[PDB]
């Protein structure tokens, strides 16, 4: 399967998750139970 290969590829070729996801703005913890 293409998924099993992609999972193996992710282990050997890790991405910069800190830049790709961490840098993107997040909702305030106090806002999580409020309006979107």
């Amino acid at each position: 399967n293409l998924l099993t290969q992609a999972i193996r590829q992710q282990y050997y070729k890790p991405i910069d998750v800190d830049r790709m996801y961490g840098t993107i703005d997040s909702p305030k913890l106090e806002e999580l139970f409020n309006k979107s």
Partner: protein, 268 residues
């Protein structure tokens, strides 16, 4: 982020306060786990501040043996947690399948656990609930601490909350004393024993007898255990918290050095 930014592959199971799904983030084709929590359900159960603390702790930890929380987002009805996908799943299922782990597997998990807990402790984070059920396994079977339900950032490092799981409770919690980060050293010892034996060391027919065995440190080693594994467990399972073997000591223990096959995952 929105749920439309992800392609849901399949469900992975039911978590404590929500279902988990295997998903792929569309922009980067990156495979991750998505934990879906319902805002109304969490508010009704009154676990809002509990979830906030768990997210606050986990989202700021970056270690190969701690499950990563990449980010989080919310919509009208749901809160979504973007989490690292652990391909080999639940550690407790593997332990139940094999009955007990061999020395190589147990020592590897002990080195990974001690390294992850050391990283927590150097940030004044106490886990307080180390047990097989709170651990996942990576692509190469690497241990991943994946629940922070009882965790606390303790700057004064002196707490009173009785927490965790019956078989893993340290004597100081049972006796109603104050506790510190050394509770994690005790739990690491119980975990090592459970990995090698398949049962926790103070297993009893009643909660009162389990409490009694714990506070007396009524440790009875099965004869199949090696001298090295018994030495490490005995050094962790000390009645007095200051006498417990430090996490650096676990990583340096000769039984860990001789049997661990720890592999650090590739990094960016």
């Amino acid at each position: 982020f929105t749920i439309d930014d992800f392609d849901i592959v399949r469900p992975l199971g039911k978590g404590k306060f929500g279902n988990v799904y295997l998903a792929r983030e569309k922009q980067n084709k990156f495979i991750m786990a998505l934990k879906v929590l319902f805002k109304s359900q969490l508010e009704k159960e009154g676990v809002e501040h509990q979830l906030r603390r768990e997210i606050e702790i986990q989202s700021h930890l970056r270690h190969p043996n701690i499950l990563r929380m990449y980010n989080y987002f919310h919509d009208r009805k749901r809160i979504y947690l973007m989490l690292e996908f652990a391909p080999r799943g639940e550690l407790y299922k593997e332990l139940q399948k094999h009955g007990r782990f061999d020395e190589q597997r147990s020592a590897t998990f002990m080195e990974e656990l001690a390294d992850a807990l050391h990283y927590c402790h150097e940030r004044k984070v106490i886990h307080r609930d180390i047990k097989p059920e709170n651990l996942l396994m990576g692509y190469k079977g690497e241990l991943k601490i994946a629940d922070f339900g009882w965790s606390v950032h303790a700057p004064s490092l002196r707490r009173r909350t009785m927490c965790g799981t019956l078989d893993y409770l340290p004597p100081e919690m049972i006796e109603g004393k104050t506790h510190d980060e050394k509770v994690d050293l005790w739990c690491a010892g119980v975990l090592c024993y459970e990995f090698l034996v398949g049962m926790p060391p103070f297993d009893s027919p009643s909660h009162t007898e389990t409490h009694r065995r714990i506070v007396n440190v009524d440790l009875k080693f099965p004869p199949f255990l090696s001298d090295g594994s018994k030495d490490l467990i005995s050094k962790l399972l000390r009645y007095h918290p200051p006498q417990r073997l430090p996490l650096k000591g676990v990583m340096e223990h000769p039984w860990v050095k001789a049997n661990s096959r720890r592999v650090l995952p590739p990094v960016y």
